[PDB]
Homo-oligomer: A and B are copies of this chain.
Amino acid sequence: TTFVALYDYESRTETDLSFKKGERLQIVNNTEGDWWLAHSLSTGQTGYIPSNYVAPS
């Protein structure tokens, strides 16, 4: 399955992909899965996490 960008996106870090509206993109799976923005109740820190490392409470 192929996706198409609806907006431009300029990369902000070393690990993200820049692209332009109309570019065609294939998702590639990996062991980490989707990444979610998360907030830790144990430490107060915040950032993206790999969804395959966690489970619901």
Contacts and interface: CB of A to CB of B under 8 A. Distances in A.
Interface of A: 1-7, 9, 11-20, 23-30, 32, 34-43, 45-51, 53-57
Question: Could you say which of A5, A11, A30, A54 has the most chain B C-beta atoms within 10 Å of its C-beta?
Answer: A54
Q: Oligomeric state, in number of copies?
A: 2
Contacts of A27: 36-39
Contacts of A5: 53-54
Contacts of A28: 37-39, 46
Pick from A25, A29, A53 the residue with the most CB of B within 10 Å.
A25
Given A23-B41, A26-B39, A35-B35, 20 more contacts: A2-B41, A3-B38, A3-B56, A5-B54, A6-B54, A9-B53, A13-B13, A15-B48, A16-B49, A17-B40, A17-B45, A19-B42, A19-B45, A23-B40, A24-B41, A25-B39, A25-B40, A25-B49, A28-B38, A34-B51
